[PDB]
Amino acid sequence: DEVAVKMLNSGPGGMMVFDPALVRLKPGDSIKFLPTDKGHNVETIKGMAPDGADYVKTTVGQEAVVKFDKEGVYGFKCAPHYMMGMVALVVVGDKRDNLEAAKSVQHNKLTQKRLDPLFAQIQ
Ligand SMILES: [Cu+2]
């Protein structure tokens, strides 16, 4: 099945957010990222993906679909707004092999503060 996530200038958590910012999926699920507001994309954050997953880098302002097959923890950023904390976390299936790795990637203060509660909600 396919879950929609909106790319927003203003939403739950403040400026430059994905809503929802935490997505639980099953292997085979897809997300459709909706350009609610223009000027957003989705891109893998290196070190925040199970080994074998393809690198994602979408075109700014377009709807995009990402299908998920490998189980594990994925972190995605909005490229132009990463410094502004626009990030999301995707959990696929039950495998948590890459969790300690993904949680160990460092970020600016603002982005870190956003991820904290998401990680907390996966533990
Ligand atoms: Cu953005």
Side-chain angles (χ1 to χ4, degrees):
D1 61 64
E2 171 190 287
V3 169
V5 175
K6 321 321 70 66
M7 297 188 297
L8 301 157
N9 290 351
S10 196
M15 322 312 293
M16 318 298 181
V17 309
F18 286 106
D19 179 16
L22 172 70
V23 187
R24 303 176 210 258
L25 293 189
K26 291 229 63 203
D29 302 329
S30 68
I31 291 167
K32 185 179 262 282
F33 286 95
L34 292 170
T36 315
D37 289 310
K38 135 212 53 96
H40 305 288
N41 76 344
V42 187
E43 178 172 357
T44 296
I45 282 155
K46 189 161 148 292
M48 301 179 81
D51 50 40
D54 304 310
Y55 190 83
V56 174
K57 194 215 316 135
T58 68
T59 301
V60 171
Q62 292 199 173
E63 303 218 330
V65 171
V66 182
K67 193 177 186 52
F68 295 84
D69 72 294
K70 310 276 171 174
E71 295 193 14
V73 186
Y74 289 78
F76 291 101
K77 66 175 173 177
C78 162
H81 310 123
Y82 172 64
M83 282 301 298
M84 283 181 83
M86 197 164 162
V87 293
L89 186 73
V90 181
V91 310
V92 181
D94 298 352
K95 275 220 292 78
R96 305 283 176 266
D97 298 357
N98 80 309
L99 187 53
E100 177 55 21
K103 221 187 75 276
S104 302
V105 173
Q106 315 168 3
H107 302 99
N108 54 91
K109 193 188 219 328
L110 141 33
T111 299
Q112 193 55 60
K113 298 329 284 231
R114 276 194 186 177
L115 288 169
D116 287 345
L118 304 172
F119 272 109
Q121 291 176 239
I122 267 24
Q123 256 314 123

